[PDB]
From Swiss-Prot, chains A, B:
Residues of the active site: 641
Pfam family, one: PAD_N
Organism: Homo sapiens
Residues engaged in binding Ca(2+) 4: 162, 165, 167
Cofactor note: Binding of Ca(2+) triggers a conformation change that is essential for catalytic activity.
Protein name per Swiss-Prot or TrEMBL: Protein-arginine deiminase type-2
Length: 662, 662
């Protein structure tokens, strides 16, 4: 399909390599002796030759005596369909004649060696490397889209991430890598003056690495041939039909300034002379897209439940164990220097996938320098990946914690489907001068593209995390889900009812000895005027979020349930929980671990517990209240335990999505 | 279409601004007294009220006596279709009842002021600002695409570019600017606690500026309200139906890291209390795309012919004048410190366009520090723009000159149309370690996107410019064009013919006295063996380019004519012209100014001139040979004159293109 110029040379024979999949146009006029009138040609059996006059092509016999007028506009088109062997003589010979006489006055010739060269990848995304996919040089989204996929190699095979260096050790490691095969066919050797070279751009050199596995005498060997500080590698040619197998790894996720696309080239180079660069004769290119980091909403099947707490919080552990035992999930428990909530706050479970393989990958929250410096690498291991983003000049705040990072179930909004859901992060109003998650992390999340992030307003909360006020739960037995929203108005309605009912003296925080002297009742709560005003204002903040969520997630009031909540304002005019926030809950399918609220007791049951059950249970959701605060004897608005659930990936393949143009 | 949450408040009246184009969902349950069973409602004539039970909505009369059960899932939907006036009382009142008795036990109410707020731009690209285009918040390419366009204001109204500062002076200046109108409708004033604010992001603040024109007592006044170091502006509200007219300017072209898209917002803000940020109640957004810098191929109608030479090169000036007099073009002549070719090398004429206006814009080549430091601003003026890109850490080379920057005619390649043609720039092979145009300039050209740049191989030439070896010409009387390629093989064929004909002693450079002692003939040229080998190699370089051009421009051999050329190799193994390169020519439609070659004289005519005429004239192209070298008495491979043609823009609108996803 590609036409290449090869001219005959005046008086001299021309030798050239012909690469299958191309064809030659050949000027015979320049090589004609002065005074020459006509020309004739001969060619071998495996070379097809057409005489082309002003676009009109005529195929010519191997030995014709046919003669044509010499003209600038009369040329040859030369095609070969099969590679040369050692038995080949592939040639075209042109004879020139003058006016008088039929014996040639000169001859010019073209001697050819045909070879096949193809750099192949699995562009059709079935896990196997197909021969020369015509689409391998581009990358397109969607069910009909094409082009190869590369995984960041962020995990660790042998006890930093595998991609932090240029070395490969074990065979298992190669499984994380995408295969790329250089397929060639030809005679025993390349003709003099040619070589085959693999290469990448300087820019891509920190995005990829390429290894070749050789099996020498003493064992299998993995050579790093392209990557950081290696931009090119000269390939050893072997004749006949040969394949060279390479393994490719990504070193970097998509990010600000990096689309995720990288390229690898192979060229056939021709030696000209000393001090003169080699001419690329033929170049073949493949494109990879590096797979994005993807999060998991609460609707996806749970795999493992991770929790952190102090060794002596017994009730919490017994109750979490009890909950998980109702499911098929496994429980993992940890008791680190600091960060009581760290499992929830310092890490987010996500995954990467390619047609041939995938695995969970953990994102690590930025280090402030006050509490967190040490990264959490304790979870870095085989087929568990690690990644992080550290701000250069920007200060870290509470909004950088991953309690502030969540993701919605799959949604359709204005007719646009988001099959992986949408990432949600808390922020402050634009003109507010308030807190915001660091740009480096926001940029990262935006760059993954397939979760199309949305900013909510969390800055009205002292801690500032979206998970304080909202969560999602599946509706059992269906494909649907609900948004759960904290509501102060719901709490006040409930307490006002219980007061009307004669329960005004009902006490909260029963069993927390450090709260006893405060003697906090429903009456005491309802009679506090400033607290009412604080909570009206917090309800306005919640409702502003409700409106953003309904708009950006395509939700109606039918999709939302309000859970009673209550806050107290701090000196910064931000909210901290008055009693534990029930909305932040462990969701394992139909089973919900719900923080125990310690609300007013009516007839020896917590009226907050009974109210939540009455909302959820009719939907087939099973509620277990989990007490994380008793071991501390009081609740000041902070929770000292954390949980994070690792989930199965979406069955929808990310590469089948079609994100909006950026 | 947008639903907003507004709750009734327990015991107290709620006052709210309602923005047309939204509607409210209203919880009446929270505000109900404890023990209340049912509710009823009244509403004014301009407020529509529906009672919504589990998604089922029923419209309700202005005064009904109807009563409904109080439930969390029974709410109101409140709609208004027209703005409030001073005669309006727009309200909804809800009465609550207990079990026993029909007299209300309490009342909660909602008092509304409806206003219209719309930030409007010409998104449909007709030059007029339409009312609230539903597509104004996005930007799409193509004939069906939508969203507003902004021009970089790079020219200068009053004798640096207008965008270099925050000031506006004259009314003519506003014509370069896109109009944006804030349209409002409402009562005499906003209710207490509200204000309207225009704003942009910190990131966009160096991409745009926004002015308001006020007409105070002593004259018209232009206030810069958004831009560098102003991120927001509080708008003065006026009642009734009002429009505020703003003018928007772009400060920056698309580039590496900047897509060309910017946003402007207006919000209605609500005051909460001291130390508490204002709540955006409603926000409306418009998007602008900044128009790309676009070049002009030789096929476009010429407007002005710019030339630079020394005052005494008389023949050049007479001959260029003669040529231009055959056309409708105007001639502009300049005689600067240095850069004899500067008009060709230091500047490129291009243009920008928006639906309401456009104008030529000059790009200025990077300063090296050896020859060029001073930018060329002499051409900066009204409706002639200026732009430049300076490398930070990168060294400038000859490939940064704009002799190395050209553009193809409109082409179709593999079925993909490039209606504006494709930009061409010379480079070196990837593995060569050779010269390349600076990244900053390459990045700029790539960022414009609509000319989809292609790199050719110019580094085999000492000067290193694509315009040394190739050019395009229209085919008169048709819509087609030809690629012209320098060819050494064509030159050797021609000289070998003339030698055979008995002309071997024909002398070149006739009339250049400084060349006389060299006595260079056809025989002398043909007998130089090393020169033959040099030129075979240069023909290989030309042919490598021929192949790239045919592939990337979708050209066949029918589209190409070869012009005889000859080079001499320098100590770096690069080519310099042996006789003037004829391919670099002034193209004014059918009339071609061609550098006079000073070739061997046969029968008192230059055989190179006669040969070129024989190729071109049959196509209806008229050739004028222009002598730029006689004033210098010799030709060493450098030309001391320059020309650049300013052309009419393409009739195809750039915004009707659909570029590939990046
Ligand atoms: Ca495949
Ligand atoms: Ca490694
Ligand atoms: Ca690995
Ligand atoms: Ca692995
Ligand atoms: Ca999280
Ligand atoms: Ca319009
Ligand atoms: Ca200005
Ligand atoms: Ca201007
Ligand atoms: Ca102007
Ligand atoms: Ca140019």
């Amino acid at each position: 399909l590609r036409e290449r110029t090869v001219r005959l040379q005046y008086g001299s024979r021309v030798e050239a390599v012909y690469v299958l999949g191309t064809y030659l146009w050949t000027d015979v006029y320049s090589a004609a002796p002065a005074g020459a009138q006509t020309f004739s040609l001969k060619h071998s059996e495996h070379v097809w030759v057409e005489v082309v006059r002003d676009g009109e092509a005529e195929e010519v016999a191997t030995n014709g005596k046919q003669r044509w007028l010499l003209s600038p506009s009369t040329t040859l088109r030369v095609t070969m369909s099969q590679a040369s062997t050692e038995a080949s003589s592939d040639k075209v010979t042109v004879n020139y004649y003058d006016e008088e006489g039929s014996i040639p006055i000169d001859q010019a010739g073209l001697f050819l060696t045909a070879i096949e060269i193809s750099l192949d990848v699995d562009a059709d995304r079935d896990g196997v490397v197909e021969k020369n996919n015509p689409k391998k040089a581009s990358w397109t989204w969607g069910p009909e889209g094409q082009g190869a996929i590369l995984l960041v190699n962020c995990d660790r095979e042998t006890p930093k991430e595998d991609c932090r260096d240029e070395k490969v050790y074990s065979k298992e490691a190669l499984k994380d890598m995408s295969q790329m095969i250089l397929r060639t066919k030809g005679p025993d050797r390349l003709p003099a003056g040619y070589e085959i070279v693999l290469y990448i751009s300087m820019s891509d050199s920190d995005k990829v690495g390429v290894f070749y596995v050789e099996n020498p005498f003493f064992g299998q060997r993995y050579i790093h041939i392209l990557g950081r500080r290696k931009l090119y590698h000269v390939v050893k040619y072997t004749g006949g039909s040969a394949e060279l197998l390479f393994f490719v790894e990504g070193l970097c996720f998509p990010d600000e300034g990096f689309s995720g696309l990288v390229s690898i080239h192979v060229s056939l180079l021709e030696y000209m002379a000393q001090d003169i660069p080699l001419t690329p004769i033929f170049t073949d290119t493949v494109i990879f897209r590096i797979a994005p980091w993807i999060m998991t909403p609460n609707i996806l099947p749970p795999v493992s439940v991770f929790v952190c707490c102090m060794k002596d919080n017994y009730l919490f552990l017994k109750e979490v164990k009890n909950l998980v035992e109702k499911t098929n999930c496994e429980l993992k428990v940890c008791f680190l220097n600091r960060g009581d909530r760290w499992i929830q706050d310092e890490i987010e479970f996500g995954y990467i996938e390619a047609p041939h393989k995938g695995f969970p990958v953990v994102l690590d929250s930025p280090r402030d320098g006050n509490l967190k410096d040490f990264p959490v690498k304790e979870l870095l291991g085989p087929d568990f990946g690690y990644v992080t983003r550290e701000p250069l000049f920007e200060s870290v705040t509470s909004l950088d914690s991953f309690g502030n990072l969540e993701v919605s179930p799959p949604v359709t909004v204005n007719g646009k489907t988001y099959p992986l859901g949408r990432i949600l992060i808390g922020s402050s109003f634009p003109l507010s001068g308030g807190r915001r998650m660091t740009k480096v992390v926001r940029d990262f999340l935006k760059a993954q593209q397939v979760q199309a992030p949305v900013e909510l307003y969390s800055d009205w909360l002292t801690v500032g995390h979206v998970d304080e006020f909202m969560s999602f739960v599946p509706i059992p037995g269906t494909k649907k889900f609900l948004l759960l929203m904290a509501s102060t108005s719901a709490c006040y309605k409930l307490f006002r009812e219980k007061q009307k009912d004669g329960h005004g003296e009902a006490i909260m925080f029963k069993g927390l000895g450090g709260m006893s002297s405060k003697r906090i009742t429903i009456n005491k709560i309802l009679s506090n005027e400033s607290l009412v005003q604080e909570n009206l204002y917090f309800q306005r903040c919640l409702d502003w979020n409700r409106d953003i969520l309904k708009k950006e997630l395509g939700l109606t009031e039918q999709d939302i349930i309000d859970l009673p909540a209550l806050f107290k304002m701090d000196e910064d005019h931000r909210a901290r929980a008055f009693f534990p926030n029930m909305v932040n809950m462990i969701v394992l399918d139909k089973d919900l671990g719900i923080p125990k609220p310690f609300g007013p007791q009516v007839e020896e049951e917590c009226c907050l517990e009974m109210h939540v059950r009455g909302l959820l249970e009719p939907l087939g959701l099973e509620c277990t209240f989990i007490d994380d605060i008793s071991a501390y004897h009081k609740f000041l608005g902070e929770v000292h335990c954390g949980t994070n659930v690792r989930r199965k990936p979406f069955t929808f393949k990310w590469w089948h999505m079609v994100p909006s143009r950026r």
